[PDB]
Design an enzyme around this catalytic site. Structure first.
Site, PDB file in Angstrom:
ATOM      1  N   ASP A 189      -1.197   5.432  -5.512  1.00 37.77           N
ATOM      2  CA  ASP A 189      -1.682   4.635  -4.581  1.00 37.77           C
ATOM      3  C   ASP A 189      -1.968   3.024  -4.932  1.00 37.77           C
ATOM      4  O   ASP A 189      -2.913   2.737  -5.684  1.00 37.77           O
ATOM      5  CB  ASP A 189      -2.938   5.043  -4.280  1.00 37.77           C
ATOM      6  CG  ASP A 189      -3.430   4.498  -2.959  1.00 37.77           C
ATOM      7  OD1 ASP A 189      -2.831   3.660  -2.355  1.00 37.77           O
ATOM      8  OD2 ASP A 189      -4.587   5.032  -2.415  1.00 37.77           O
TER       9      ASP A 189
ATOM     10  N   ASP B  99       0.835  -1.389  -0.057  1.00 31.88           N
ATOM     11  CA  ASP B  99      -0.062  -0.023   0.059  1.00 31.88           C
ATOM     12  C   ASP B  99       0.603   1.421  -0.132  1.00 31.88           C
ATOM     13  O   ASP B  99       1.330   1.715   1.052  1.00 31.88           O
ATOM     14  CB  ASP B  99      -0.697   0.081   1.146  1.00 31.88           C
ATOM     15  CG  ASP B  99      -1.843   1.159   1.230  1.00 31.88           C
ATOM     16  OD1 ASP B  99      -2.033   1.623   0.256  1.00 31.88           O
ATOM     17  OD2 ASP B  99      -2.473   1.259   2.333  1.00 31.88           O
TER      18      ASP B  99
END
Ligand code: 52K
Ligand code: CL
EC number: 3.4.23.46
Length: 376
Positions: A222, A34
């Protein structure tokens, strides 16, 4: 870096994860990769939908930091107890580091019901670390305690649910994972991996919006978000232009908003009737840009759990600014060059594409007033 190639795994819609080991003796856990968060948070309790969890009592090297965290999101939320312990990555560099760990003791709409991961590896910077920036992120610790260079790179490859894979190269770049050249865009501020989109193009046609709109309130890269998320005004302009560009067949207004699916006959996918999408990123040099270009294969995603048959529109409206999620990152090999405050993009060797078109990273181009595209 041959030993780290193909070290990521996953299912469609559920993210890419890496195997990690925590504690002494080592406990194996699957952890989501992440780039849009900064905590190393793992399930530390027997949640019924988790396969594994971190059992602190079994670890001789665990140290309690005697501090709680409560982290809510737009929908989901988790709560945990901070600590440190010895962490390693089996298909990574042969090192072991003392990292901060948020032992997740309670959650809601955070873990995915029947995914194969039990935590999140937040790879962004300390400024967005919960509860505050004094909690050092995992990658900051790895770099401090070892000779691993301060960069990593992600090749996310894409596809009842299809089994995806990929590579997280830690401490370097693997040139077999990309074709053509890497093109670099500056990290604007070290919190999220923030960048500046300077121009958007749908099927070669410019949207002609003020470029502050593209980065309002920010644009980020992201790995923990599926969609290409766009600011509301940019999304409306984009959808309108995609709609005009794709006038072969007509669909309902709910399809573009992600309120319903669209379905064709099996094995008759119309890729050719949808346009390529191009984002121009700020370059390394004053007044210089470059463009990354994605295909419909990236933003029209096949949904496997219906009861290739049906598809979902993976470009959505955002109030948190642009989010260059998996939709973008499945097209390209992305190098998070922290040491030089920049992010590299190259055409990925594993990106899905037809015989007619491919994804692209082209440049250089002359774009003026690129620093004016930033929001403050
Ligand atoms: C911490 C947080 C977060 C929490 C919990 C789960 C997930 N992510 C996923 O489930 C997922 C799914 C599909 C794909 Cl391709 C990638 N990631 C993200 C918050 O929301 C956005 C973000 N960047 N990180
Ligand atoms: Cl204990």
């Amino acid at each position: 870096f041959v030993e780290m190639v193909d070290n990521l795994r996953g299912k469609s819609g559920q993210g890419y994860y890496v195997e990690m080991t925590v504690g002494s003796p080592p406990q194996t856990l699957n952890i989501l990769v992440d780039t849009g968060s900064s905590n190393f948070a793992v399930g530390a309790a027997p949640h019924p939908f988790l396969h594994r969890y971190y059992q602190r009592q079994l670890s001789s090297t665990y140290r309690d930091l005697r501090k709680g965290v409560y982290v809510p999101y737009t929908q989901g939320k988790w709560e945990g107890e901070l600590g440190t312990d010895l962490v390693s990555i089996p298909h990574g560099p042969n090192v072991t580091v003392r990292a901060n760990i948020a032992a997740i003791t309670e959650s809601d709409k955070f873990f995915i019901n029947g995914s194969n991961w039990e935590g999140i590896l937040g790879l962004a910077y300390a400024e967005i670390a919960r509860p505050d920036d004094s909690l050092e992120p995992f990658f900051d610790s790895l770099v401090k305690q070892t000779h691993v260079p301060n960069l990593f790179s992600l090749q996310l490859c894409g596809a009842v649910l299809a089994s995806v894979g990929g590579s997280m190269i830690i401490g370097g770049i693997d040139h077999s994972l990309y074709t053509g050249s890497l093109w670099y865009t500056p990290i604007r501020r070290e919190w999220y991996y923030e960048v500046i989109i300077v121009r958007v193009e749908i099927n070669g046609q410019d949207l002609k919006m003020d470029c502050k709109e593209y980065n309002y309130d920010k644009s980020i890269v992201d790995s923990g978000t599926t969609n290409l998320r766009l600011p509301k005004k940019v999304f409306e302009a984009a959808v309108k232009s995609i709609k005009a560009a794709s006038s072969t067949e007509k669909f309902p207004d709910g399809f573009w908003l992600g309120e319903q699916l669209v379905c064709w006959q099996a094995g008759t996918t119309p890729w050719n009737i949808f346009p390529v999408i191009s984002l121009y990123l700020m370059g390394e040099v004053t007044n210089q840009s470059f463009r990354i270009t994605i295909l419909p294969q990236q933003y029209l995603r096949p949904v496997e759990d219906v009861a290739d048959d049906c598809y979902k529109f993976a470009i959505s409206q955002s109030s948190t600014g642009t989010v260059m999620g998996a939709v973008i990152m499945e097209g390209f090999y992305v190098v998070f060059d922290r040491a030089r405050k920049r992010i590299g993009f190259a055409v990925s060797a594993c990106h899905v594409h037809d015989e007619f078109r491919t994804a692209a990273v082209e440049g250089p181009f002359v774009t003026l007033d690129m620093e004016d595209c930033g929001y403050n």
